[PDB]
Design a protein around this ligand. Structure first.
Ligand code: 7QG
Lengths: 152, 38
C-alpha cells in the first residue's frame, strides 16, 4: 500500500484506534513529523515501512527513502492546509501564511488550530505541490495556535 | 505498533473555506525541535 496521497497514522496502544498524526506518501516515500511516530516503524496493510531519515530538530522523518518534498512557499500567495483531523474527513483550508522570524531565517506559518492528531497534514500551493507539514508551532497571547510550514 | 490508512489525494480545492490571519512572530527553535516566542 504505497499510492501517492495523504494518510492517517493510527495506533492501537491506547483505548480504541487513536490517530496520532498524518503523513504524505509521495514517490514511494512516506513523510510525517518526528513527534508523530518518534521514528517508530509503521504497518501499511501486510507490508512494513521502516524509517530512513529523521531529524528531531526539524521534527521530520522519512520512510522507505530520502525526503522527497522540495516545494516552497513563494511568500506571497495563499496556501491550503489539507487538514485530516482524527475521526473526520480531509478538508482543505485556504489561508495566507504568517512568518516565523528566527535567527537563521524566516519560515511561513499558518494560524489554524486543529486537534493534536492533525500533526503532519500537508500544506499545498496553488499548483498542488506540498510546501510543508503542519504540526510544529507555538501558542500566542490569545491561547490558540500558529504552526510553522515545516519543510525538509 | 502503528499503522497508516489512506485519507485522500493531495489536491487544491477551488471552493475551499478561507480563514486564519497572518501574524509576524519572533520565535526561537531549540535543539529539541520546539518553537518558542521571543
Ligand atoms: N494548543 C493549541 N492551541 N493548538 C494545538 C494544535 C494541535 C497541535 C498539533 N501539534 C502538536 O501537538 C505538537 C506536539 C509537540 C511538538 C513539539 N515539537 N505541539 C505543538 O506544536 C505545540 C507548540 C509547542 C509549544 C512551544 N513551547 N504545543 C502545544 O500546543 C501544547 C499546548 N497544549 C494544549 O493546548 C492542550 N491540547 C490542545 O490544545 C490540542 N491542540 C493543540 O495542542
Amino acid at each position: 500500500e504505497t499510492t501517492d496521497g495523504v494518510y492517517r497514522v493510527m495506533t492501537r496502544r491506547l483505548l480504541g484506534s487513536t490517530q496520532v498524526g498524518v503523513g504524505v506518501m509521495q514517490e514511494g516515500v512516506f513523510h510525517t513529523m518526528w513527534h508523530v511516530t518518534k521514528g517508530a516503524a509503521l504497518r501499511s496493510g501486510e507490508g512494513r515501512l521502516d524509517p530512513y531519515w529523521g531529524d528531531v530538530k526539524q521534527d521530520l522523518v522519512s520512510y522507505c527513502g530520502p525526503w522527497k518534498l522540495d516545494a516552497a512557499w513563494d511568500g506571497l500567495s495563499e496556501v491550503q492546509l489539507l487538514a485530516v483531523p482524527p475521526g473526520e474527513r480531509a478538508k482543505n483550508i485556504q489561508t495566507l501564511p504568517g512568518i516565523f522570524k528566527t535567527k537563521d531565517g524566516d519560515i511561513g506559518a499558518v494560524a489554524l488550530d486543529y486537534p493534536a492528531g492533525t500533526s503532519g497534514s500537508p500544506i499545498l500551493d496553488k499548483c498542488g505541490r506540498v510546501i510543508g507539514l503542519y504540526g510544529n508551532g507555538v501558542v500566542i497571547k490569545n491561547g490558540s495556535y500558529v504552526s510553522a510550514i515545516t519543510q525538509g | 505498533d502503528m499503522y497508516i490508512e489512506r485519507a485522500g489525494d493531495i489536491t487544491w480545492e477551488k471552493d475551499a473555506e478561507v480563514t486564519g490571519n497572518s501574524p509576524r512572530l519572533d520565535v526561537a527553535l531549540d535543539e529539541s525541535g520546539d518553537f518558542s516566542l521571543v
